[PDB]
From a paper:
The spike protein of the SARS-CoV-2 binds to human angiotensin-converting enzyme 2 (ACE2) through the receptor-binding domain (RBD) and changes the conformation to fuse the viral and cell membranes, mediating viral entry. Here, we used a structure-guided strategy to engineer an inhibitor peptide with mutation-tolerant and potent binding ability against all SARS-CoV-2 variants. We named the peptide CeSPIACE (COVID-19 eliminative Short-Peptide Inhibiting ACE2 binding). For engineering, we determined approximately 2 Å-resolution crystal structures of CeSPIACE or its intermediate-stage peptides complexed with the RBDs of several strains, including WT, Alpha, Delta, BA.2, BA.5, or XBB.1.5.
We identified a 39-mer peptide region that was easily chemically synthesized and modified it to improve structural stability and mutation tolerance. The high-resolution structures identified the roles of the peptide residues and provided information on which residues to modify and how to modify them. One of our intermediate peptides, Ce149, potently inhibited mutant RBDs up to the BA.2 strain by enhancing a hydrophobic interaction with F486, but its efficacy was attenuated by the F486V mutation of the BA.5 strain due to the high specificity for the F486 side chain, making it vulnerable to mutation. To solve the conflict between specificity and universality in antiviral treatments, we engineered CeSPIACE to recognize the invariant architecture of the RBD critical for its function, thereby achieving mutation-tolerant affinity.
Numbering used by the authors:
A (entry chain A): 1 to 39
B (entry chain B): 333 to 528
The structure:
Amino acid sequence: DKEWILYKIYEIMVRLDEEGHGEASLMVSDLIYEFMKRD
Amino acid sequence: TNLCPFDEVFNATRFASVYAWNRKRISNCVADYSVLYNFAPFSAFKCYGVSPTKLNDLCFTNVYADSFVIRGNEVSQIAPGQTGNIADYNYKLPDDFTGCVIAWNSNKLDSKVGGNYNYLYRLFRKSNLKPFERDISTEIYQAGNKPCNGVAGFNCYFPLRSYGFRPTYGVGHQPYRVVVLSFELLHAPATVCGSN
């Protein structure tokens, strides 16, 4: 559902940062904002 | 009166995180706004309700200087009528804003090898900020129906994230220092006057 995929996107944001992909992590952070702004 | 301490704001060693943005009240002083325009090669400089070149001529009751760091691509949200992760959840300007927004690239100061995690932003929030509201809370955001009880996990997310600025980042992801000048004219004496 919407809650599961949000968790997975959050999880991938954190993982990207932990593995040295901070710029990619910031782009996923942007996706989280847009996703939760949708109806 | 003395000179207005705009150097204390623009040339400060450390800037605030945007979600906990700093505000400095400027009053009872003379402001040479020329040292402002030549402080750095500004990547943003837009005034609202005032002419930028005529600031040394004007007088105001108070000047408020707000300052913080964001990503280059987010600088455009520091403007009236804007939406986005920063305008909604971190720093919000009113529609009737009277002042200037000034920004410059600070990659050489705020980036770090391995990542600068000192600068944070708010990713989660139930509603948008009001103009000039500041939310410094760190409550766990509840995305589901189950209350979180202060524990991070599924559907329960810590609301802040760090920028992690590194000098190798693209320019749109590099840190930018932002100063927002609010020019206030109340029914009261004007004690902040330009050098002219």
